[PDB]
Design a protein around this ligand. Structure first.
Ligand SMILES: [Mn+2]
Ligand SMILES: [Mn+2]
Ligand SMILES: [Mn+2]
Ligand SMILES: [Mn+2]
Lengths: 383, 384, 384, 335
């Protein structure tokens, strides 16, 4: 008895943004709060989106106070604006920060409380405000997830908030908005997409449904991600990566992740490094730790990342996945180890301990000890 | 490019999922649900089991058990009246595609007015329809994930498709334990219709990477386990794998599209009153062979996914192997050798063919057809 | 899940194993044995040599040489009488499956009372039975290790299966040296029945990893050495290997089950008085083709274990190579081409099928049958 | 003439512990003496009309005081719960019912504590009782089971009967032992490991063991270490020593442990067996040598001597000298 949670309406493809208003009109929206970063508000994309929405008889207001690593303070600022403007819907424009902020605003405005009071897994009881998420990056997949991560203000800890009700109501994935992404950013986000697909395939809670999307995501990523890193104007590469991010997000949201994300959450937060790059640096060693758990699947992954496994044993084909991960990492210039990125040995223990406590660690195919995590990070320190 | 993906936002696929109905109904804000089912399931008690679950959870329920195979306009409007009298705020469908589609039509017409035959085709209706919770008892149809209801008009003796995004079910309940007692023939028909759904979705014109995901995985699962369920219906793992397969094929053809298999089967099964799955199974080999020039590569892939070793073959050879795979499956499941034995008359071919031309599926078929093309397909599907 | 595994606690396999009977019978602690055997065996004098071992151990002995092919209910109740008359405390069985089944049935009825027919089907006898030491002279049956006794009904002509954990022998003696003088036809019948046991247990519904182990080994050994033993009976190595394969196939089908092969041959041999292994070999390719859709992967494995090169082949193709291999072996041993040459008449088919449907084994069959399915199997095996 | 001794009744699978009393019933037992699982077991026993008593003295290593203590509370039948220790202690013909909590040892199916009358009357293998086994216990116990299967397949007294169970044990272990090491809450993995332990145990009881156990009996006795881990450390070098004896079967073992020996000579295929065992050792974190476990060179000689007189050395496919055993121990000290 497994649950499958996906946005009931998704528009994916060139020009998809042009349908925000249309989509909000079907949900029956009267007025929408747009949540974005200050920069996108300066680019004018927020204004174009608001125009489209208002054309469909849906009023709009803007909350350009989203920041990277969203915080409860701004979440509640946005709930305040929601109430003052008398909004009935939320629309998010940007990366994961915008999306998670919007989801938290909706949760608190419908069921009340502090977003602090929603840490952990929740079964909120009130009807929740619809959220329409427009993605501008090909990674994260937050337009399809039931998870928002908000940082506590006082305690400087991050809080995961999981509920089937924050699962966005409309997901708009337009590749055209992703074209001006620089090459390094494309690398980071695409490697996080690959991270999602690989972790979902070997996840403890993988269903055949999750595996469908995960496998197709690995196929599409393997072909076009280098092409999108090479020429960002290649709209076909951008479109295949858009679909790949979507499928990978659904896959990990319902199936699960693991130590890759657990480790890189701590490493990135502490050392202020990019999510995708940390994920890519530690994935080859995490998968080695996980090899005994899902051997057949890691052989399949080696084949899906583009290796000739014919005439190989399932153990050999499994290890070829690690070889492929290092091949990809070398092609996109991922750092050689964590040490280059500034990780200090004296911190590993902490990084391990906190990573042991992450919600992601529970879906990892191999049950870990704090020392297992520590040894993973140590092996990832330098090549 | 401006492609829409509609899917039930919540699905519970697993053993004992039926018990979740009320809970999920509670999470939509439902107060009074109307249960729409057939007559058998009612006599079996399932309607009242579900009803109890609903009532305990705090929701109220009424039972409309007049859904019939080959859903028809009469019962649709009748159940609409019952919906209005009992002042129900939600719908819960328990059974095969008949119950699901009839419930979709009930809620649709309950909101927006006239006869369901008026809402034929693709509709963008503007009044929100009530939530639908669909509990499936067949490893086929896919109706608990589709935005389509097949309401048959006997006034023209044709199964009419009715498509609107609002009749996409809001909760999907796929419990394999309600599918255990399915007799062998029903298992074959449902499973082969699901196979048709995946195969017609893969080669469909509007197929997208997302649809191909579910279509490929459904084909792999069907190949591995559908014979296992046909042999022993009491193997819960086989039933469960087929449940996942059917769900994914439903999503696939809902968002990618079907083709001339379903176009033809609608006419043949509406006129001669035969089972949908077996009609699909008799026509598929020939429809696919017609389509071969359109999607040679993907048909070679189907050959591999349906259990053929296409190593060292031309891509055209590997594609041809898909028809061999299909015919092998057909014989293994005892599918009638031809449409002729099923009672189809050569005289009616044209009128079936011509009418098949007007089904929406012909516009999703990979190869753009002529009425005489379809006629030749139906001719070849008569003997051997 | 929870599975019970019943096996003789002590087994002596190898040349000269018959030397240990009396020894073991003292370790178990017995004083009044009843050598149950046939009369031909009694004239061979084996009766008195085994009795010499037993009387040297210090156990009184009596001989009841009334075991016949198709062991009847009449001789069962008659031997039960002898058991009571000779105040026998222990049973020793010397012969093929007929004698073994007779001795264990004697213990059964002497314990619980009721005649033989009352114990058709699976029973859970509550009255303890006497220890049994089974000395086998045929490389088939495996009845030295089974909880089953195949006794036929007089009137209904049904070789009744009688199953109980209490009748599983306490000591099993497999001496290949007693198997040398077996004619080639008897070697064929017994060995082909052992192959039958291994195959049915591999595809049985109640198959476990333990029973699977034993079935696989039995099939490998049979493929290599049964033809060798059919050619030259004096080859003691081949006879010993066949003894091992029979032991393992007996444990496998005892604790995993059988299927329609034995269901059908029970009726055909009860009605027309025909050899068990021959009937089984005549029906096996057709039973396995029906059951293919259930265990395709395992039938491919069986093709490889019976000596087929399944390289570059689909699992469907490899599974069909199992039928090919079985037909090949049949030809190599001269098995009848069909039941028609064996005198089976189409008129009885219905009855056969009906009574086969009520056999316990049909419930072990991977593919759930109907009476008409069983009928079609028997029909297809009539001629070829 | 070869003998095959096995418990006459074995209940294997999830929930098997429910049949204890049930099986006792067909034994015709009256009371019972069990050598907080104990109380629920006794409740099920009483649920069939069977009186119960308890023997909580279950000292791990062997002893005689506990045997005589049990004798004092005399009873008609015995139930034994735990790993090898409890079974061996209750081995002291009164029926013995053996409930195993580890997927190794196989003592629930053995005639050793050395007589066929101490083979248990009933064997109960419940994977549900093994879920809470920590990863170290899982690795040790499963690797001991693999040791059993491997040693019995190349053993001198092997029969086709024993070879059946040993081959299937090796297959099941190859696929599922890493799965149970990764997530012990996987019931499929633990159930497969249960069946594999049972089969490997029957196989080594009837077919025999070899120099792996000869060496590790001494090493674990002297330095107080884990049986499975010691076996895992010397098995690569022991198998290497035995290669010339059963080269064909070692190539088969390479295949069974997940290697592709296709296109390889029987020699190369045999060497791939050592390659596979070393891979498995590294995947499970086995110590690199006995030296990291605290074994000292000065003792090797004595170890060798004592290992030579173990009966297992007579089952080894290759007949050894004390100096051969000493070389093996030395080679396994460091990597
Ligand atoms: Mn991520
Ligand atoms: Mn259909
Ligand atoms: Mn037989
Ligand atoms: Mn051991």
């Amino acid at each position: 008895t497994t649950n499958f949670f996906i946005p009931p309406a998704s528009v994916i493809g060139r020009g998809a943004v042009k349908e925000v208003g249309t989509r909000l009109k079907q949900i029956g929206a009267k007025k929408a709060l747009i949540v974005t970063d200050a920069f996108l508000h300066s680019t004018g994309l927020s204004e174009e989106v608001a125009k489209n929405i208002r054309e469909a008889g849906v009023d709009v207001a803007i909350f350009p106070k989203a920041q990277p690593d969203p915080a409860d303070t701004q979440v509640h600022e946005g709930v305040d604006v929601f109430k003052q403007e008398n909004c009935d819907s939320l629309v998010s424009i940007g990366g994961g920060s915008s999306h998670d902020t919007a989801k938290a605003i909706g949760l608190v405005a419908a069921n009340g409380g502090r977003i602090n009071d929603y840490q952990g897994v929740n079964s909120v009881e009130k009807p929740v405000v619809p959220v329409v998420a427009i993605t501008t990056t090909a990674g994260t997949g937050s337009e399809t997830t039931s998870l928002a991560v908000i940082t506590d203000s006082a305690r400087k800890v991050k809080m995961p908030v999981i509920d089937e009700k924050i699962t966005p109501t409309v997901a708009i994935v337009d590749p055209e908005l992703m074209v001006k992404k620089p090459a390094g950013l494309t690398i980071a986000t695409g490697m996080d997409a690959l991270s999602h697909a690989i972790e979902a395939y070997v996840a403890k809670g993988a269903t055949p449904v999750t595996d469908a999307f995960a496998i197709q995501a690995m196929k599409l990523i393997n072909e076009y991600l280098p092409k999108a890193v090479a020429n960002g104007e290649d709209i076909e590469a951008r479109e295949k990566m858009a679909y790949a991010q979507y499928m990978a997000g659904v896959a990990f949201n319902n199936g699960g992740l693991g130590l890759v994300h657990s480790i890189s959450h701590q490493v990135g937060g502490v050392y202020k490094l990019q999510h995708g790059i940390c994920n890519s640096v530690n994935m080859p060693h995490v998968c080695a730790f996980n090899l005994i758990a899902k051997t057949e699947r890691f052989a399949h992954i080696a084949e899906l990342l583009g290796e000739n496994v014919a005439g190989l044993s399932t153990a050999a084909a499994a290890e070829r996945a690690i070889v492929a991960l290092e091949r990809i990492n070398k092609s996109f210039g991922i750092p050689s180890g964590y040490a280059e990125m500034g990780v200090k040995e004296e911190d590993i223990e902490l990084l391990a301990k906190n990573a042991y406590e992450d919600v992601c660690t529970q879906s990892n195919p191999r049950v870990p000890t704090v020392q297992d995590i520590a040894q993973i990070i140590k092996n990832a320190m330098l090549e």
